[PDB]
Every structure is written in C-alpha cells, then in structure tokens.
C-alpha cells in the first residue's frame, strides 16, 4: 500500500516514477504494486493524469549524463513520434528510451541500448522495437536546429 501510495503521489505531483523504479526501492513486486495502485485509485475515487514521454526525459537523460541539447532532442523526438502515431500502444517509457537512444546515437555522447535500458527499466529488445518504429522518420522527428555529430542518414539501423 505504501509503495502504491508513493507512486500515486509522484504521479499527482507531476514527476512520475515507473513501477519498476518504485519496485527497485520497495521490497514489493511490480505486479503487487500495480494491483494495490488500482485498488487505491478505486478507494480514493480519484484519478491520475496519463503519463507522457516527456515526464521521464529529464530523469533518464540526467542519469545517463547526456547534454541538455541531447535531452531536448530526445524529448522532441518522443513528443513528435507520439503526435505522428508512429508508436501506437507502445509504453511511454519504451518510447522515451527509444528517443533517447536515437538522440544519443545522433550526438557525440553515444549510449548503448543496454545502458539506456538499465536506466529506463526497459529491455533492450523493447528499445529496439520502438527505435525501429521511429527510425524511418528520424529526420522528421529530430529538431530543426540540432547539431548532428552523426548524420541522421548514418544513424544505426536496427
């Protein structure tokens, strides 16, 4: 109950933490935390705003030690991908991880799929799927005034 309440408090304060992030600090499993979260929402008769990719960008990029420009590029890429509906049904965390990978590979500070998955709580395979979904339109997703250390055409294909 306490872990689910902590997750709900983060969501309500507007700095949501992933269920995996909460589980990492709580002895309770992610499944139990989610079940208690649903029950708490029903009991309180309240609601929490849907999470967006931009919610986790600051924390993920800071933990990856990426530049502010790379963080902005990743946030823009994720938001534009959601707007264009290139990742339907995909989890916001997965979309954010894929966008961060794209930005990191396009910038000097390059981070591996394993690294991004470790910080974001998302499997490298899921990151691969989301990145493959957003890769075809990478030039469209990237911000206009972005300094590509690696040209968008030569971004990793996978």
């Amino acid at each position: 109950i306490a872990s689910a309440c902590l997750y709900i408090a983060c969501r309500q304060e507007g700095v949501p933490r992933t269920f995996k992030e909460i589980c990492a600090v709580s002895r309770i499993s992610k499944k139990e935390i989610g079940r208690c979260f649903k029950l708490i929402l029903k009991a309180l008769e309240t609601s929490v705003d849907l999470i967006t990719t931009g919610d986790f960008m600051s924390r993920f990029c800071s933990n990856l030690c990426l530049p502010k420009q790379v963080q902005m590029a990743a946030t823009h890429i994720a938001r534009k991908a959601v707007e264009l509906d290139l990742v339907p049904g995909r989890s916001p965390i997965s979309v954010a991880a894929a966008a961060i990978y794209m930005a990191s590979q396009a910038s000097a500070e390059k981070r591996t799929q394993k690294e991004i998955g470790d910080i974001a709580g998302v499997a490298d395979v899921t990151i691969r799927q989301s990145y493959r979904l957003i890769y075809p339109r990478a030039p469209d997703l990237f911000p206009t005034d972005f300094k590509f250390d690696t040209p968008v055409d030569k971004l990793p294909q996978l």
Partner: protein
C-alpha cells in the same frame, strides 16, 4: 582540541554502527523466512544522512534520542556581522564544563596559552575564559599514524 574531523568521526562511527545494526536486523528477518535478501533494500540511508544533518543543525552532538547526554553548542550559526567576527568564529575554541573544569577552573589565562590562544579575546560575562580564540599562527595537528 576536537575539531570538525574527530567530532564528525565520532558521530559517523556511531551512525555506521547503527547502519550495520539495521542491516543485520533486516537481513536476519529474510534469512529466518528462508528467502535471500536484497542488500540495497537492507540499507537505510537516512540513518547516516539525518544523523549528520541533525547533529550539525541543532548542535546537540549525538543521537537525537540521547540528547540528554549529547554535548550542546558544538555547532553554531556562523556569525556574519563582520568579516573579523566570521574569522574569529571559525577560529573559536570552547572549554569543557564538567568534572575537569570543576576541579581546575579554566577561567584563567594560563601561561601555556602563549602563542596558542589569544590572550585578549574572550567573551564578557559567564563565558569569560571558557571561550577562546586561536593565535594568528597557531596550528592544530591533524594527526597521523605512528607506524
């Protein structure tokens, strides 16, 4: 003279003893249940964090539960009325009050204070001779191994 280092070392030793105590308790519960334990979950960071912060903030030097026997006045708000006041506060010394002080009065300018403690600087009132200031070139040994 117990400077910031040794005092913080005493506090940190106490808090680390505590930290290992809760680590033992948490791990023991899981071991008794037969399931392995997560080391990261076993650690309470607030022990060290809040202990150091509370000691330095309140000035009661010791565990917040043992404030009765915890030394007081060790930590004070830096005096910023003047630069000279700030320097004096940073070079201040505090004499003890207890059996030693009762048996021998430290409210006096002992000959040994030459070159070590300022002979003129001392508060007026109940603190005369108990609060002292280092001489300009006085240095306090930081300690090293005798090996």
């Amino acid at each position: 003279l117990d400077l910031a280092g040794p005092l913080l070392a005493f506090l940190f030793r106490g808090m680390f003893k505590n930290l290992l105590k809760e680590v033992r308790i948490y791990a023991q519960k899981f071991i008794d249940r037969g399931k392995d334990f997560n080391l990261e979950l076993a650690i309470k960071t607030r022990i060290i964090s809040d202990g150091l912060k509370y000691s330095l903030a309140t000035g009661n030097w010791g565990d917040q539960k043992k404030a009765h026997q915890a030394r007081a006045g060790v930590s004070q708000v830096l005096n910023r009325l003047t630069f000279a006041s700030t320097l004096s506060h940073l070079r201040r010394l505090n004499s003890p009050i207890g059996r030693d002080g009762k048996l021998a009065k430290p409210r006096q300018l002992h000959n040994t204070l030459w070159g070590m403690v300022c002979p003129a600087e001392t508060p007026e009132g109940h603190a005369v001779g108990l609060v002292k200031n280092l001489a300009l070139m006085a240095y306090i040994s930081v300690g090293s191994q005798p090996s």
